[PDB]
């Protein structure tokens, strides 16, 4: 269960930077060999990686990194707005803390800086993740775990990162400088039609 958990971050993250792409088989052997584990080592990651919605078994194919359907994504933003609205909405400027919203925030511009569009999408799930923690729950936290993977792969899939992010990041500090000045009504109401926004232009150019 250690050297698998360890197996299975290797493999997450090279799906969540996208060296892995959207639809590319994981060997067993090259894996393997590459980092001298045993195969048992290499299905038990697997299966993790199938709980996470990162890969699917495919019959007697192997496996390969997920593609989300238009459907999924649908399913993504619902959760997303049930989740981070309530982060946003509930927040309690005298007492809630924003330094992870903003730690975000600034590594975006970082990514932006230096052209790392894919990076730039990952700092957005860290962004809006950020936001879901606000509802202070643990349990909400483990829960959304594989709605930001499944988010971060519809990201892969999308290949459009550098026009798609810019203009969702200069939204994001709109929404985290209201939080700031406290205005969590007026934060809430930017990141629904963020949310819906976001929605309907993955879809218009999904697949």
Same mark, same amino acid.
């Given at each position: 269960? *250690?050297?698998? !958990?360890?197996?299975?971050?290797?493999?997450?993250?090279?799906? @969540?930077?996208?060296? +892995? /792409?959207?639809?590319?088989?994981? *060997?067993?052997?090259? @894996?393997?060999?590459?980092?001298?584990?045993?195969?048992? !080592?290499? /299905?038990?990651?697997?299966?993790?990686?199938?709980?996470?919605?990162?890969?699917?078994?495919?019959?007697?194919?192997?496996? +390969?990194?997920?593609?989300?359907?238009?459907?999924?994504?649908?399913?993504?933003?619902?959760?997303?707005?049930?989740?981070?609205?309530?982060?946003? $909405?509930?927040?309690?400027?005298?007492?809630?803390?924003? *330094?992870?919203?903003?730690?975000?925030?600034?590594?975006?511009?970082?990514?932006?800086?230096?052209? =790392?569009? !894919?990076?730039?999408?990952?700092?957005?799930?860290?962004?809006? *993740?950020?936001?879901?923690?606000?509802? $202070?729950?643990?349990?909400? =936290?483990?829960?959304?775990?594989?709605?930001?993977?499944?988010?971060?792969?519809? +990201?892969?899939?999308?290949? =459009?990162?550098?026009?798609?992010?810019?203009?969702?990041? !200069?939204?994001?500090?709109?929404? #985290?400088?209201?939080?700031?000045?406290?205005?969590?009504?007026?934060?809430?109401?930017?990141?629904?039609?963020?949310?819906? =926004?976001?929605?309907?232009? @993955?879809?218009?150019? #999904?697949?």
């Amino acid at each position: 269960t *250690s050297r698998t !958990t360890r197996v299975a971050g290797i493999l997450r993250d090279a799906i @969540i930077d996208g060296t +892995f /792409r959207p639809g590319a088989r994981l *060997s067993e052997p090259d @894996i393997c060999a590459a980092l001298d584990v045993s195969r048992n !080592t290499v /299905r038990e990651a697997f299966q993790i990686l199938i709980e996470d919605r990162l890969v699917a078994h495919e019959l007697n194919r192997g496996v +390969f990194v997920r593609v989300p359907t238009a459907e999924d994504i649908t399913e993504l933003y619902i959760c997303r707005r049930v989740v981070e609205c309530a982060g946003v $909405n509930g927040f309690d400027p005298a007492t809630g803390d924003l *330094s992870r919203v903003a730690e975000a925030l600034d590594l975006a511009d970082e990514r932006y800086a230096v052209e =790392d569009w !894919t990076g730039v999408g990952t700092a957005d799930i860290h962004f809006h *993740s950020a936001l879901a923690s606000l509802n $202070n729950s643990n349990r909400i =936290d483990e829960l959304m775990r594989s709605v930001w993977n499944e988010a971060r792969l519809v +990201f892969h899939v999308m290949d =459009d990162a550098h026009r798609f992010h810019g203009p969702y990041l !200069t939204r994001n500090h709109e929404i #985290y400088d209201a939080l700031a000045a406290g205005n969590t009504e007026a934060a809430g109401q930017l990141l629904k039609t963020y949310l819906e =926004d976001a929605e309907a232009q @993955i879809l218009g150019a #999904y697949r």
